[PDB]
Design a protein around this ligand. Sequence first.
Ligand SMILES: NC(=O)c1ccc[n+]([C@@H]2O[C@H](COP(=O)([O-])OP(=O)(O)OC[C@H]3O[C@@H](n4cnc5c(N)ncnc54)[C@H](O)[C@@H]3O)[C@@H](O)[C@H]2O)c1
Ligand SMILES: NC(=O)c1ccc[n+]([C@@H]2O[C@H](COP(=O)([O-])OP(=O)(O)OC[C@H]3O[C@@H](n4cnc5c(N)ncnc54)[C@H](O)[C@@H]3O)[C@@H](O)[C@H]2O)c1
Ligand SMILES: NC(=O)c1ccc[n+]([C@@H]2O[C@H](COP(=O)([O-])OP(=O)(O)OC[C@H]3O[C@@H](n4cnc5c(N)ncnc54)[C@H](O)[C@@H]3O)[C@@H](O)[C@H]2O)c1
Ligand SMILES: Nc1ncnc2c1ncn2[C@@H]1O[C@H](CO)[C@@H](O)[C@H]1O
Ligand SMILES: Nc1ncnc2c1ncn2[C@@H]1O[C@H](CO)[C@@H](O)[C@H]1O
Ligand code: NA
Ligand code: NA
Ligand code: NA
Lengths: 471, 468, 468, 468
Amino acid sequence: AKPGFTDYIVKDIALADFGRKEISLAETEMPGLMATREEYGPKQPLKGARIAGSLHMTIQTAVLIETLAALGADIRWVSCNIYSTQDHAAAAIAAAGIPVFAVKGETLTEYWDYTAKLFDWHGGGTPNMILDDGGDATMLVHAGYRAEQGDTAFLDKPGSEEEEIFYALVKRLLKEKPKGWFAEIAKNIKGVSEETTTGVHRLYEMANKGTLLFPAINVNDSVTKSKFDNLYGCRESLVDGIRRGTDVMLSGKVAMVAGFGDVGKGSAASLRQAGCRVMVSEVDPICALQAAMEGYEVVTMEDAAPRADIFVTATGNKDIITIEHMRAMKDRAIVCNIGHFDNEIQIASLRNLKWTNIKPQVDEIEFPDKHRIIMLSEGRLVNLGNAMGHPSFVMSASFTNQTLAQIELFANNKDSKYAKKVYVLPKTLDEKVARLHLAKIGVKLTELRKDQADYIGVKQEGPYKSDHYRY
Amino acid sequence: GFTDYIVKDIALADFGRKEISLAETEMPGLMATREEYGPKQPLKGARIAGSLHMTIQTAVLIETLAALGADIRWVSCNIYSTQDHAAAAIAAAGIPVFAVKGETLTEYWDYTAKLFDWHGGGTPNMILDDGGDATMLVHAGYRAEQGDTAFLDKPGSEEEEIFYALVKRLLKEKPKGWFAEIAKNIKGVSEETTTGVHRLYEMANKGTLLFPAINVNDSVTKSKFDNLYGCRESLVDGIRRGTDVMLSGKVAMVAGFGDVGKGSAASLRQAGCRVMVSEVDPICALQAAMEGYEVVTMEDAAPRADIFVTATGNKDIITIEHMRAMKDRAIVCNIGHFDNEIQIASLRNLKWTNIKPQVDEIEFPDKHRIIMLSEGRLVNLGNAMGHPSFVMSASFTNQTLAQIELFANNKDSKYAKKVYVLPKTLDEKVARLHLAKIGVKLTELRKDQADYIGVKQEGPYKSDHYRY
Amino acid sequence: GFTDYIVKDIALADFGRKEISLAETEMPGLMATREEYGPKQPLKGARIAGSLHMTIQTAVLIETLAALGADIRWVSCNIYSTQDHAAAAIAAAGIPVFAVKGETLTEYWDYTAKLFDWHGGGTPNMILDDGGDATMLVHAGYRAEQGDTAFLDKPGSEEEEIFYALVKRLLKEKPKGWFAEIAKNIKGVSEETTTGVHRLYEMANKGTLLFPAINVNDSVTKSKFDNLYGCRESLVDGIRRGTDVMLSGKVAMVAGFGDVGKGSAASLRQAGCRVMVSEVDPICALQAAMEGYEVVTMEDAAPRADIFVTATGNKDIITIEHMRAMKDRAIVCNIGHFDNEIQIASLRNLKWTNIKPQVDEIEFPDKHRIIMLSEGRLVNLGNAMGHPSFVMSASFTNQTLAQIELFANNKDSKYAKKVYVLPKTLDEKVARLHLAKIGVKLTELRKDQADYIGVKQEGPYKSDHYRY
Amino acid sequence: GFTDYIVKDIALADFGRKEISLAETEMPGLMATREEYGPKQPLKGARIAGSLHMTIQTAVLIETLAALGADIRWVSCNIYSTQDHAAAAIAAAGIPVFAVKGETLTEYWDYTAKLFDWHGGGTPNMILDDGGDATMLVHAGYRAEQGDTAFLDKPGSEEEEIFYALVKRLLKEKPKGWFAEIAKNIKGVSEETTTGVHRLYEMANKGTLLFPAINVNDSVTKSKFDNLYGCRESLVDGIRRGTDVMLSGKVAMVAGFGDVGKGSAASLRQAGCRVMVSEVDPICALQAAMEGYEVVTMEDAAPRADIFVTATGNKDIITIEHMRAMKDRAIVCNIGHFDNEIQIASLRNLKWTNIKPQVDEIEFPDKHRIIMLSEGRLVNLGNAMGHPSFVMSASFTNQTLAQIELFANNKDSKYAKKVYVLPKTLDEKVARLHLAKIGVKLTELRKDQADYIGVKQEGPYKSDHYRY
Ligand SMILES: NC(=O)c1ccc[n+]([C@@H]2O[C@H](COP(=O)([O-])OP(=O)(O)OC[C@H]3O[C@@H](n4cnc5c(N)ncnc54)[C@H](O)[C@@H]3O)[C@@H](O)[C@H]2O)c1
Ligand SMILES: NC(=O)c1ccc[n+]([C@@H]2O[C@H](COP(=O)([O-])OP(=O)(O)OC[C@H]3O[C@@H](n4cnc5c(N)ncnc54)[C@H](O)[C@@H]3O)[C@@H](O)[C@H]2O)c1
Ligand SMILES: NC(=O)c1ccc[n+]([C@@H]2O[C@H](COP(=O)([O-])OP(=O)(O)OC[C@H]3O[C@@H](n4cnc5c(N)ncnc54)[C@H](O)[C@@H]3O)[C@@H](O)[C@H]2O)c1
Ligand SMILES: Nc1ncnc2c1ncn2[C@@H]1O[C@H](CO)[C@@H](O)[C@H]1O
Ligand SMILES: Nc1ncnc2c1ncn2[C@@H]1O[C@H](CO)[C@@H](O)[C@H]1O
Ligand code: NA
Ligand code: NA
Ligand code: NA
């Protein structure tokens, strides 16, 4: 009746003006995305692309969405986490006429219903590109394909609440959609670009077994993503989530970080810089040695559980903090997860205990002996759930990579240089991403003279480092 | 059946109570003070008028004062610092409080006057003050009441206009001699902050101070923890919540390198900023340089920093000429006092656009914009939640001990109409109360070791001139 | 013909002069003091006996006093802290100096007595002291000369025995009344360090202080710079030169968190160690915890830490029982005072093996070993070069102004036989003299801004109770 | 009766042996390798010719190889880095070593040749090379001996003239076919430097590499310690020992933000400097900016900085134009490539004044001066002691494992005449061996956790593309 366009689901469409104000502020902080718009504008490399996006529906993501649209893309979007949407960013995208299905605090049932909506393209048909963060859109396609080719038995063996919902979803879509719908989608998708370490792992798995249905670009392992987003982004946004959720004094507290890869390194720095004394656990002896060389005590979770005030899982692995650990923690210890999903902490094992909600994404859990723990975002990503995720400037680097990966797969694969395997962007594009961000922060880069470039075996314009260089 | 309050939304009270419970665990000094003094009820008969940021941390202080026997009325000391769920919890507990986040300046001063209309009639007999506004209202009313009225016709500020209007109104609507009645009944004031304490010493020096005062700011366990470590935690929190900018890669400028300036510069450098500092005091300037900060003037910094913070307690630090020279979408804020460290009033003929509560974008004729936080009032309290509970436990344990001193320990008039600080034995006790919660194990001196350095095993361990 | 000196190798004098010239550029406070006061000759007629670490930095101080007109005799105040090339340069410039790195305790006390036999006859009329040893010789000799001699037969350490033997030999050899003659002629003493100042305040309280004293340690520009930032730079320098250990990944324990312990902990933490702290003072312990250090007892640290540093000014901090529990090749050192923070004397019958100067390996019957630096005496001066020149410029400018105060500005006897500190105007001036060299640009208050915070534009900017 | 060595002074052996013992405790990777492989004697029958900086740390590596069964002859790979007491201790243990600190280029090359006159006759069968000089000698002599001699005449530099004359001399004084005899007997070379590995790949791509090679430069544990952590430990050490300047308050410029530059900037910032950086690589520049460093050109830095450090591996980084613009007594040094980062030769007509070994003052016609460390050579090895033992234990454990791989694990010819890297499980093993000494407790994965992230419980834990 009142709006002509309603092919979207947002919490409050009246937040759109506020969203637009914050998007305009983020654009100033995202020079790489804005420069990418100017450069690729005239040529419309994404004209004819139908991008299904599954990525935290934040203000930063809204700038990415509008960059893809400025390059010619038709778009449908969902968040990849039930607590990470910023409702004013989702309202601004809906108000711009782009189908988005994203609400902060949506349920798991809604989450998966919304993901399925990516694939009913407005006007008929399917997407032809996927932009993924964590692999959930990619997984819907592959599980439904597997089931539709006749291997349905896995849909009846659910191991968790979200598995049950997911398996229910695939069953319902095989019941309601035209026969062969998943192979139709599969044949139409020209590529997937994937943002995060866990999603990328799921892809290399499928690619090794030969089950990956379309080419993929691993955006996580761009240098200007993994060594910036994963590291500096968490260094800024982990303590932001903990402060907004709890308002605790960090000076004087002991924090335990599980994992010392890129996210754990950034998370331990976030906490140490804020005043905590940080301990770390690791299974990888190189990463453990790095933590020790940075001055962190390296201990087991059993050693840390009776002692630390704050626990952060940063592993991408499962069953890091168990009910046994939480039974041993001090009263009102804080527990949260910056890694993945909701199984780094054994949330499901806590569900027979008394939970008291304090405020959105903050709960107090009471044990039989009366000691309590404070749980943030029910064990899901604390920086996006309890605060606002990474700040715009570092997401500009991640999302310039995403945009260039979408151009590669959609526009620069006319010769099948990308087969049904996982690829990374070339170093010349990685360097270009960094170069686009230097002016905003006042870096003055030195130029090699020809004799200096020759001396070290590089061209003046780069690339400056071998493909094996680790930075 | 209780109605004697003004808060934004009383339905927030349950949320407030839950966060107050969480804060109690983080406030061992206040909680131990309830246990030690609760049996003796040292504040029985006290009528405490409090003017202090109506936060969750202040709620724990109010309820400690009440556990010690005090009758209480409360207001916030800043128009943006109230936490509305804290205020609602205090109202729901039957305690008169008049505190709304984003209240107007007229509401602010009218609420302050409501402190002195005690429920049941009469006046308070204690003041607990942060920034001296409640104290100033009594003294200015007293002065006018005595017949020195001309200063009321000479406001140099809009808020001065509101404040003199209020005094004029109370002179007409309250009985003859009401300010002298309040002055004679106030047994003492304890004041929390550097600016308020300076105004106290200056009244005491001129002979105009009407009742005894304890300078709580200069407790070691206040000035060297709250002003330093508090701002180190809460400054960047206010900036992040207001703006969500990446601090790594940004240049920030901090005016002042006293206690708050030291904590502020640390807040920003620890968050990844490259930090520059201004100072007028060569000792503080040399401290900043030895800590690795570049020390520059505001004129030097104005065209190039991304973030500006005033931390001086002084006026006219960031001017319209500075702001005209700033880069587009520079962030400006104040963590010191009042709203005149930045020349906010000089901006009010420019285009302001509200982004969200306590965040505005100000556009200049040449189209460059600046981002102003909390309309240039305290950014940590206005844009976030102020200092965290643990460090406020130390400040507020000092406040509670100061209230006990003035109301219960002045039977021999040891406190005259002068400004006093608490003794080092109490300062050391406040520290000691916080050690167990954070796992500190203290060493005990043996007697011959205590003798060798000339202290008693139980302290005090330092001379009164020691600077820590 | 001039040989009224004792140095290790007079051939080091050219090298010493080269490093003195380099240090002058790094010491703008002292050089500016020469420039201002040289032509006024305020120390003309002064005969200054100095007992202070005979380093390159002290040589710039000695030549500053000489440039102000002083006649001088000098000794080091520590047996391991002399830099032999600095001593050789001072001897080459014709100033009596008695200082060798590695001199014995016997020589150390014989050299101190040489201060008082002034060349050309007579005694000194000023003392510049670091640690109080020259001052103590005078007071012990005077006490014994006034009849009270029994204490001389009751030493409780080998160094006391050497000291008491010296006093006895002086009373035997020198003209009757010699100590009273010295005491009558000394117009003042200025004292550099925490321990020395504590001894002076004690004597003042007991009425035994023989002449006026200035406590130079408690200038802000000494205690909050030298004690803090000097140790932050020179502690880890001493440990690295002594041991060359990698510090990243090691656990270190610092006893004390006053000014020297704060700087020491920072030195180790900035170098990559995980640092623990002990304290007896709850305020300093809370500071350590708020700065992120674990606060533990020495008993908890002893089996765990790789590196131990005493920073207390107190005795018996690291005992034989602690060292028995330490892991093999743990490193032990002292940055505080004398050699009794660590129980070195209880180690004397274990097997010691010298590694190199000021580095020894001590082995226990169970075969674990510890690495001892400078035999438990000041590690930053014994194993490396002491504090760098720039921070010593602030300390030594203070010392120079104190000699001026006592020698040239006591015509009205404003300084009685008590302990005084320099005024804040001089403290501020010291800092101001150091700003240009490190590129600090100070802001100047406008008149209305000064009036607003209640200061003069020229300072002082802070109250006398300000703690910085 | 042992005489097969050339060192400065065999009497230094006892001091060297004391320091080797102390380093062993700090090199748990090498000592644990002795424990694990000692019983198996994997290097029995190995004749290892080593060319690696002859320091105390390298002595521990030499005795580790011997502990595994190896016969050994050794030389330094650099004329300046030899520690004469380390060389003496090795000669005194009966191991042929030819290494004197400060030897001529001619001696450097003749000593390298002596690696190949094996005691008892015959040749080495293993090379442990650091920079590729020993490998280059074999390959050039082989090339000449096959009849391609034209290159031996027509050299460029003086070092090339020395090298070519050495090849000519060996072709006369050694049997016909000597170089081909050596080539056929070498079972492998391990090499850890960039330039050495570049030479090996270049020869492998051209088919001219004569035997298998392991590139230890590729190792994660070698690369992070030898480049990042080692320089973070030893840069400021070299600067302090050379100059004793206060770092707090100073501005430093680091050219390069690769691994050595990252470690150097951190070294200086942690010690108190405010650090600026230059870079040509936008990714490395952005890293530096995100870590809070100002990124500028050398032209911008030249008039401003107090200290300059070159860390690029490139040439002509600091030029005469830059040094003309520097402030008086700025400090200049190099931690990057062995020479040519600073234009030293352009200073040769200025007045140079030696201050002490490896410290010189250079005076410009306008009388401003700069302080040059180690004549532009490596400041950490030249002015101090290089990387600490624990750092070198990581790189040297890698070398030991590579020697084991080539000598003992090539029965199936899995290594042909190409360049290989150690597999990630041996890189992980290097780290594993260092964990117990520094108190790390590693978590073990359960099988379902290992499965979930796609790894075996025993590793490797990361893909070969992982950057750490
Ligand atoms: N927001 C908070 O939570 C919080 C906490 C404590 C105190 N405060 C307030 O912060 C302000 C500062 O308090 P403080 O304890 O740090 O005081 P302080 O005296 O220790 O420090 C103020 C510093 O400002 C410097 N200064 C004065 N005018 C200057 C100018 N024009 N330019 C540069 N520097 C100048 C002074 O030299 C001084 O060192 C006060 O108003 C105080 O009440 C706020
Ligand atoms: N080596 C140097 O270059 C250098 C520089 C300045 C001062 N000093 C000397 O360092 C010593 C300390 O000086 P300071 O200025 O830091 O004094 P301080 O009073 O500021 O601090 C000493 C601290 O030691 C603590 N303490 C006392 N006994 C203790 C114990 N048994 N265990 C743990 N802590 C204990 C005190 O509580 C105190 O906080 C003095 O001897 C001083 O003369 C040395
Ligand atoms: N002193 C030591 O003990 C020690 C230890 C390890 C390595 N090194 C040597 O240090 C050098 C650097 O090693 P690295 O591992 O850091 O190499 P790297 O390749 O990781 O870093 C070199 C950096 O220099 C930058 N660069 C090149 N030319 C430049 C210029 N004109 N201006 C500014 N930046 C420039 C490059 O972009 C690169 O990021 C090599 O010569 C290496 O062998 C010395
Ligand atoms: N503000 C944000 N907006 C969008 N994505 C974000 C934000 N913060 C972190 N992320 C992304 O979330 C991923 C984790 O699911 C990370 O790979 C990171 O790139
Ligand atoms: N390089 C130095 N030269 C002279 N005195 C020093 C040096 N380093 C530290 N000191 C002084 O030694 C005192 C301790 O005896 C400290 O108070 C300090 O001022
Ligand atoms: Na954000
Ligand atoms: Na708070
Ligand atoms: Na020195």
